[model samples]
Target chain A: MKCKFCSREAYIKIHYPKMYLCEEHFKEYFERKVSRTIERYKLLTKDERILVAVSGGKDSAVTAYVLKKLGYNIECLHINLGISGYSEKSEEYAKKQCKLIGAPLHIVRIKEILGYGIGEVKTRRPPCSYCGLTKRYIMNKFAYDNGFDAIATGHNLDDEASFLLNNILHWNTEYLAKGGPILPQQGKFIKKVKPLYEVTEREVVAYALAVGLEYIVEECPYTTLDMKGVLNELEEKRPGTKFNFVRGYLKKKKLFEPKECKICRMPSSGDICAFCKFWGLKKEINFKVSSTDEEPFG
Target chain B: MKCKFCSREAYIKIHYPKMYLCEEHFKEYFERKVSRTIERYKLLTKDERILVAVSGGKDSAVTAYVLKKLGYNIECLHINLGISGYSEKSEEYAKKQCKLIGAPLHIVRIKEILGYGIGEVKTRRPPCSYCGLTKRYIMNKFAYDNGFDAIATGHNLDDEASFLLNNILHWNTEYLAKGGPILPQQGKFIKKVKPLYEVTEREVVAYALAVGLEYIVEECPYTTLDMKGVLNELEEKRPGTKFNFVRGYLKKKKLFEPKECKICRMPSSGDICAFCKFWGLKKEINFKVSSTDEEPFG
Candidate 1:
């Protein structure tokens, strides 16, 4: 097979408009898409500090690499969720990725900040929900205070589409109203943007491989059942399914009034933010500020 | 072995809230749900005339029975899309259902009305789309001319959910925007409501069995492919998924600008209604109108 853009041999085949890409052209394709997403969402300008939340996975690692190569003012944030082996290995990858990208890195331990590790975060809700709330809380608090314009994440099209379907299934209005590629800064929260929102999980994996990014490829241990697997199966049969979901929702997107959490002063749909209720603790819980804070790179 | 509502020998088991019900309680449950849906949507009033579109299927059959039992000023309309055995069987069941309920029935032949039946309905679009267009055009024309307050379809929760997912997957806003339990009247079109919008197909089937409704239960032949089977599989793994989808959309439903088809003046999202394009040559083709018009029973 030949690359659509170049005469060189193709390295990967992508569906949904169906095309082949060679090694060099694949990286260009990946980076161009990221650039386009960032531009389209107005995620950043020429001068703004962007901190990407890295989970040691291909999605985040590639995100950091792409942004750094694009010459963006970007940094990396890694939280040690204290998931034993997974957390440790993840942190190690995050650190090495920072070294390779030459981007500033800050490693925060969840136990130190919350006074309890993820495994010990007790709540009536499932551990997954609690874990999610904790991560968002920490990400927001750290970014909002530490002089960052936007807090970026590695959420891809597949992730967004699955989440959209899940929200639709549950009639989760609050969440649905807040979903988009970029969430502007509100209340005490810094801007949150997903640069990979248009690409699929498989595309990210291929991009990572084509770009030679040494990233961890294991699935997270805490992962439970989700409809994503079923969605992924459907996507395999029919490409562009996930893309259509995000695009369709955007065409008729709804916005909600942003309320504030009385205690944390964070933006939320309800009076008390979900993060606050899940943790049973207010934000601004100062810890040791356990920051590795390496020599900052672009 | 036990009814969730009462102890009178359970007849059916249901997922999604997970319950079993005896025949008596099941009918009550079914009827009450249909009642609540109609009331919630304000689909009809005491004096309004409702035209229930029947396909001789269990869903439509059960819908007619429940509405009649509730003492509604309702009638029935069935379109005979000449498909050999299928059309004859469907008409037979529809005729018998009307007789059982002692309700007035009107049967329109697509071949006669459109100068050609679904089997001969030639067009560039898929046979299914053409069939859909022809049915809608004939139904609306008859319903509007007959002065019905609303045109009710037998679209249950499962059907809507699957179609919703499909629309979301394809970014088919024309379909998604028109989706809802109650579609208010626009232009020359009468209101369209789905009385079985909240009920699942399983429940409808169960209701049919409990009420002993004589109806046809065969699948249509023109359905090439859809996400309903996949949605069903997903629901099997995780119950309430489909319900969540329908309810979720209701919370943030997007409204579209209803455009008028110059030819039919029907409320449509496009310049020319789908039905108009499909049967452009069949405006006033007046063939033998096979009217079963039994001594008008309300």
Candidate 2:
């Protein structure tokens, strides 16, 4: 079959007796997806410098590749959580990808930056939450200090769908309201944009495979204890297990309206960011060791 | 069989099999539930008054009956959405119930207050969201004005369990973060409480039936148009399908931490209360309306 849009000579890649995008069309398809997202969300202005959170994962690598290919001025930021070999491999791949793409790379070691590595933080709580909180704090502080316009992440449709279903089934109105195509407007802190927000994780993997883009497939060793893994396993057994339905429902219900936070003067519902509060840090504290020896730390 | 706690002569209630308590024992059972909830959540102060958002439905009516019986300084707040004869009957039932229980009642008519009733508003979009928003807004405003400590709602375990499954299936962390017996503390606004958070809807119905509490059995005429009904149907097919293992898991996780919103300064996503913001009339009016109009006039 010919390329859907470009009419180029196409090579078919079959996964399940069905044709996926050809190599040439695949890159174009990925680019178009990013472009549509930008247009839909008005993610960035031409003058803005974008910080891409690179983790050497397929999703982040693909996102960085496409955003760079699209001619955006981009920088790569990676947080090494020191998850044994996982963090090392992720950092190496992220560094190589940044070098290849000619983007400046900024690497922060979790222990050096946050006073403790994942090894030291002991809790049954999902590592993603703590890792995410640490990464975001560092990224936002870096962005604010350096005057970046926005910070980008590779949160694909599947991640979002999973997140949406999780929130809705839980009847979490606050979270549902905050989860949007893009994060709402806030001051100083670079607006977080998921350029690959609508693209499925499968598509990201397929893009990587089609282009021979190298990425780590091993799960984060520390993340095995996360309960979300159990939820993911259950969801895999059911069709339409993705939270897209809930997102679609919430959108239909007009649940995405942004609200002003009085305390932080940011867009939020709770009086404070649970992320900041749970981590026991003030919004103004860029990085601090808030964990105690006896407390359940994450 | 004798009551375990009271050792009183227990009589079968007929509505709830294998469950029997004498009048005094039953009241003790009900008070115990309320007392434990209060102690567990630290929901209200001794001096602060509580306003129960009553709808003359089984959930709210039963909630009011129990709280009143427990000797809490409780008041009933009802919103007449003006759903034809339905609202009138519900309002009458609510008023009569409040009177019987000797609790002060506060009634707000949507048509008179908002200058538009349910029929008029239902023309714009699904009535559920609007009804909930208006109800919450009026209730909160009333509580704030009347010096109430907290506003209680009758959201039960079935509703909460369904929400938990829905959110987990979607992976909405923000919503999951907000799920708890007590809403996070915010300034000025009355803290919202779910007194029936752990109680099953079946139990509520049984209790109400046994007590001869008058309540309308009809589902909201508008709710039948939503996916919740479909979920309820699916649950019926697999009895206890909605309140299965996930609910138990969440309960065990004690993932019910209430974090204050620092940004919006209102009760919200740690930073802001999107509920108050999105439902806040001034903010909503600023957004574009994007739905069809269809109303059945009274």
Candidate 3:
């Protein structure tokens, strides 16, 4: 069939918005949606030195590639969790995408920075909670120390929506308030934003393929253990499951007034942020967070 | 196996709060939930007259029966929409339920009152909306004229939740805001409340069965062709679908301050509600809506 925008052959069919587009038209559509997301949330500026957390997966890869393509000064940041075989391949794809997109790349090894791999953490608490804490802490530290203006992550709508559903089922209103496209930096933390706020994983993968961006196609080794499998299947059967969730959630989100952690100088609902307590970073750092850091993260 | 509260064999399994109960315990549970709902919302006062809308179905039947058992001063009001076989059976069952529930039964007919049956309304709009509007208009008028404190309906959690999903899919925020336990009275309008807000259809059906409360088991002829069927099936597969939705929605519901309709003196978002415009009733009602104008004969 002809593309919705042109006479070229259609490459993908998106049912929620009900559109069919060829490679050329699809790429244009994808980029427009990305920019619209960015502008809608005021996520980034042309002058910002943005650091994109690339997982070597289709989502992060497409995010970094698109930002660079849009003429933004962007760099790729890949974390090595030191998972045998998987981390090696993930790093390889991250490097290849950076090379293809012609953006500078940075690598941080968990073993070197935190003295251990995520797989080595021995906690009754879910390793994922620890892993996510470590990742966020490291990313925020890396971006701020490197003097980047903002940090971007390839958090597509499905990832967001499933996480939202998980939080909702638990009645976690705190996390609900914490969710959105752009999370402004608090104190020494670098701002973080999800440029792919509205786009789905399918759209991101299609964009990655249509644009001929070299990226890893495998799921994360740790991902098979999560709730995404069921949620993604639900999304497949019921189109717009994720988008509807995000939209509805954003409307329903109740904001919390954050107070600075007396220990780590980061924003927290209580005196100490959960990350600091999780990582035992609380005892080492104490500062009066006097900076009015209301900057929007990319 | 056993009821959570007693050694008796479990008669019901409630998924939202996650419990099983014996027939005796379940009855107590149902009554408690209904009372809690009433108290939580301040739905009624002891001295006030309550008009219960009874459809003869499990939902309304259980509603009227439970209210009476709880010692509330309630009377049943059933609308005969003149659907021939369906209407005849529905009316019969409604009367039987009120008799058993020990509440006075009142009947209203569409042809005798509205000049025609709902099935006869010639409009592009779905007949259900027309039916709902007519029923609501007549009920409100009846309750007001009869000096009832509030008009209560048998809208359970499943019905509310399914309606929520349907509205969300269409991004209908108006409907979402309109949903909840109680819709406070607007100008010249009596308040409408749903005391079955916390209960599901299954619970109500079980309550009806356990109490030997005779109820019409058949659905309306037009009922099988709606989104509720799929949503009901979804509720079966994923328990708590409705309860979670209603709870989350209550927190998110944005209040709309309604204004008087110049045409009908009813509460409306615009100068006139869609009902007034749809029926051309705005111009016909010159007199103030004074009483429970119980004279139903044309």
Candidate 4:
């Protein structure tokens, strides 16, 4: 097969748009879609300092890499859940990803700060559940403390679609009411956006390879797989399933409303946010980078 | 295996409740659950005449059978789409189903009235889409003309889950806003309900066997299978997935509102309902059963 725009041999075929493209064209297509999403949602401005959450996975690596290339004043934050084998590998990938983008990277280790890695917590709650809460809270806090205009995450079309499917199946109205490419800032909560909102995971992988970037291939030990697999199966049968699902969800997300958390003053369904309540926190955790913590390392 | 309530060797295993049950015990469980669902949703009252739409499928067959056993004043209607090879078999199964229920049955042949079976139409629109509109219109009109208080369908948990999944994936807000166990009567439209709303397809099949009821197992040639298969796969991984998804949707369905169609004065999202607009009818089609058309046959 030949590239849609050139005589070069096809490197990948995009399902939704139904296009076969060589490596260079595919990378161009991927980056262009990310830029379009960011601009379409007004996610970031060149004047503002943006924080990209780099998880060392292909999705995040691509996210950070793209934002830097798009000319956004971006830095990187890698939340080390401190899970023995996973965290070390993720941190290393994060370092490499940021170095490739030539952007400064910051590290927040759960074991160093909270005295426990993600799965090491002694609680009845599942590791993934608490791990999510920790990551969300830390990302927002880290972005807020640093005076960043917005926080970008590695969430792509597949992730958003899977999350939407699971939440719709479980009818998690709070989450459903709060999904989209861009979540505007609310009272000390940092504005959150996903530039890869329209790109599929396959596209992200292809783009990663095209850019010569290596990322962690394995899933986090504590992540849900069933929803993702089911969605991908559907996508295989119906080309634009994920993109359409997320788009439709964005239009109807206003049906749900949010309240302010008493402890952290972030958006919450109850008086206290899930993060504060889960950790039994009475006061907000400060995330301002101190003078001694200025070192950049994997 | 032994039945949970009795010593008779288990004839079926219910996934959601995680129970083993004998033939008799399972039938009792199934009927009791259906009765509870009807009462819970206020779907039907014993005094009101009910019309069960028998599609020659297990779900509808079981619905008609159980409704009669529960002492509801009921009759059955079979809309023969007039598709060659498939429609005749469906009508035969419908006859057997009504015979087992010992209830009066009515038939409407689309090919005879409209000069076309489902797929015989000359248009770009899919047959299933128009077929749905036609069936819905005929069932409601028939019940309205026959003085039936409500219309019951064979939509089980799996079907509802699949429909919900497909609609959510497509973000069909019109359909999403109008899904549940019951849809109340509007103007000339009769009340619509689903007795098997709480039961799974597997359980429905088991109940059919327990009661010696045989239904057409083959799907209509025009039916979409991917969503159903995807949902069933998810249900296999997580027991009670379909039930939870439907229940959650029921709770959130109120977020969507309906309007009256100009032509039929029925609930619709647009000026003209899909049925009227598709057939280009300027008026409503009366469904009152005439004396000459009262003959019951396969």
Candidate 5:
């Protein structure tokens, strides 16, 4: 098939809008969509220093690459959850991704800070539940400590849609109230944005291929999977299901109200934050990067 | 395999709460659960006259049979959407079911009332949408006219879960807010309840076989399907996913406030009810069964 804009062979087919584009055109299409999502959400400013959380996954890495190309003052942060085999590869990919974008990369090892990586901790709480808490805490604190205006994640439409679906299924109103393309900056929390919010997972994969962006293909052992499979089936039968679900969620998100955590002081549904409670921390963990720590971690 | 309560060979296996039961024990178990669901939701009382909307399906037939066996003052109403082949079989099954339950049956033919079956309409709106409106209106009106205290449907756990999933996927808060095991009486609208609310589709099917209840297997021409398929897969992988989702929805349903419809005086999000607006009716359709009309149908 030929590209919609030009005569070159089509590299990928966009499902929702129903278009086929060549390699170069697909990249342009993807970048432009991400650019529009950024503008639409008013997620960041050209002058704002953005910290892109690079997990060595296509979504995060693509976000970093696109943000850099879009002329945003962006840096990268890689939190090595110390997952043996996985974290090492993820950090390596994160480094390579940042290098490709010519952006400064920071690495944080959970094993160095805490006695356990993630799964090593002995508790009733699942590894995924605690791991999620650790990642969010580190990402936010890292950005806040470094004075970054916003923290951009590789959360694409699929991720947002799945999160929204899971939350709505359980009627997690407070969590539902907190999510969207842009979560405006609250007290100690950094403004969070999803640059690829409008794009599909398929588009991200295609864009990554076109851009020669190599990412970690192995999924975290603790990561949940079935939600996307279910959603993708729905999306295949009903195109734009993910996009529509997420957009509709944004419109009704204001219905839920959020409160502050008593301990870490981030957004919380209860008295103490999940991160603080999970780690059994009596006080907040400091994520302030030392001024003398200029070199990349050994 | 032996039944959990007795030594008789197991007739059916229940996934959630995991049990195998002999035919007699399973029937006893199913009845007790329905009885408890009725009490838990306060759906009906012995003295409150109830109208069961029997669609000639296993769920509805089971509901009618159980309500009769449970000693509730109940009758059956079947709205024949006048879909040529399907409606005839549905009405016939409804008759046999009511006969089996020893309850009075009422039949409302949509073609006789509106001069067209659901699919005959020339409007852009889908048949299933309007058919839903028609069925709900007929059921409620018939109950109201007959002085029934509440209207019960054949909606099982799977149905409720699918409806919740579909509504949540679209973020239809107004619809989500409106649904649950019980929709209380308002204005001219009669109270509606699902007697089979706690039971799964599999249990209902098994119960139907155990009770020797026959039903129409052919689905309506315009019925939507995929949502249940997706949810069932999720349910299979994660037993009680459907039940938990529905329970969660009920707890948070009060977060939404409902408004009244101008035309029909029914609960609505907008000034007019979907039924009234869809039918372009200036006033409500009087469903008072005339005193002279005693027979089911010609």
Candidate 6:
């Protein structure tokens, strides 16, 4: 069949069902989507350097692919959570993709950086919270040290919708208040950007499959069950309901713009980033790094 | 000057400054504004019997005026809180306005209906929450008894915006989820509609003045010193900030349309409404008349 926009002959690649994009149109299609999203969100400025968080997953791979295609100077940063085979495979996939995309890559290993691997950490609590804290720290440290403008993640509409639904259902409004395109501004740290803000999980999956992107599909061996998984389960039952609910909430709520933390000078709530509170950090980098924070590079 | 749409010599009587709309043109303009809002939000249905919760305050007065102008079958329902001169003045204004609008008026006195005045209630605690709860209970009971399809509150955009900002700042997702144009679907209970959902307080006040609707301008005696005031103050300093923030949030995050609770079968979290829970049922009449075994009217 003729492609809708380009008049190119588009045929489905049976390897990935429901996926069809001609080689000629693939780059252009991806570029246009990214450009339109960038313009719509005002997410980036010409002068700002962005650090892309790579998880070696389909979503992050798609994000990096599009950002590079759209001519943004991008650096790939991955946290090796030390989850045995999962970490190895993810790092391998990330490295290969980084080589293909010609983006500078930084991989931080958990044990080397945090003195503990996922296996060690998972023995304690679920380690997901700790992992999140560590990843944030690594991202922040990279931005501060390298003087980057922002940290870009591959989180799409589905992820955002999931978090938003979970927060509403749990009545965790503080977290919901923080969950928006523009995170509350903290100081000297990189502002996080979700370039795939409008893109759906379905679209992301399609993009990855179409590009023949090698991403880690296996669940982490040390994967801890989280509430998000349960919410996603419920959401899958009612297609489009999750997206609509979050979108409705965003429409109804007024989010505070990012501002420098008065006390810690971090980019956070008007006062201080809650991460600082969790870490018990009086100053920046005062808290112990967890498995989530251990990236290959600073 | 000629009217833009009608091209007639503009009438001086309805010349809205900077609007360039004449009497007929202005009426069309305002009607269109009201109609578009009603259509966009699905704020009303053609066959639904709407009961306007009237306080004779500018907000409620404008709500009644606009809904009436929109050609809805609206009847004014006023709760006389029985505060010294305030209740008397509010009831008088409501009755006069109801007569002018040709809508039937129903006045429920606190002393007569609730068996105690607000003054007596205030002796125990600040009667603001109690007053609102009792008023809502009575209103719901009256609507259910009268077979009204829905109850319209005078909550405008500013009121919603203030509430949204307060919820976001405090991380009150439960309340935020509950807040919207139409209340969640509950069995046997009439839907609650905010016909003025998009109308700003300034617009409503200006609309009242321009339309020559007499309303009480004084703040209620039992008004609580709370976050709403803080938000209002924030808005005074930054005009349109709060409104735009809320609008932007909904646009960007899609934070509305919450998942229905499996347990309650209502569009709510599994737990009780936070607003209802926070205020507690001891001091005030519970408004969940429909949810309980007792029929709302009974």
TM-score of model number 6, chain B: 0.74
**Candidate 6 CAPRI assessment class:** incorrect
Worst 10 residues of 1 chain A by lDDT: A218-227
If you assessed candidate 2 against the hidden native complex, which CAPRI class would it receive?
incorrect
Q: Give lDDT: candidate 5, residue B149.
A: 93
Highest TM-score: give the candidate number: 5
What is the iRMSD of the candidate numbered 5? Answer: 1.1
lDDT of each: 0.77, 0.65, 0.75, 0.84, 0.83, 0.65
Cα-based TM-score, every candidate: 0.80, 0.47, 0.77, 0.89, 0.90, 0.45
Candidate 4 structure, TM-score to reference: 0.89
lDDT measured at residue B229 in model 4 versus the true structure, 0 to 100: 84
DockQ comparisons of all candidates to the true complex:
0.46, 0.05, 0.13, 0.75, 0.68, 0.02
TM-score of chain A of 4: 0.89
User: Model 2 misses residue A108 by how many Å?
Assistant: 1.3
lDDT (tens digit, per residue) of candidate 5 on B31-73: 9999999999899999998988888989889998999999999
- For B39-79, candidate 3 gives per-residue lDDT tens digits of 99998777778889888888888888888888889987888
What is the alpha-carbon lDDT of model 1 when measured against the actual structure?
0.77
Q: What is the TM-score of chain A in candidate 3?
A: 0.83
Chain A TM-score of each candidate structure, as shown: 0.87, 0.74, 0.83, 0.89, 0.90, 0.75
* lDDT of candidate 5 over A218-262, digit per residue (tens): 435671358899888897798778778887877887777637777
DockQ versus reference, model 3: 0.13
- Model 6 chain A poorest ten-residue lDDT run: A286-295
Most accurate candidate by DockQ: 4
> Of models 1 and 5, which has the larger lDDT?
5
True contacts kept of 2: 0.07
List the pairs of residues colliding in candidate 1. Answer: A169-B244, A169-B245, A171-B248
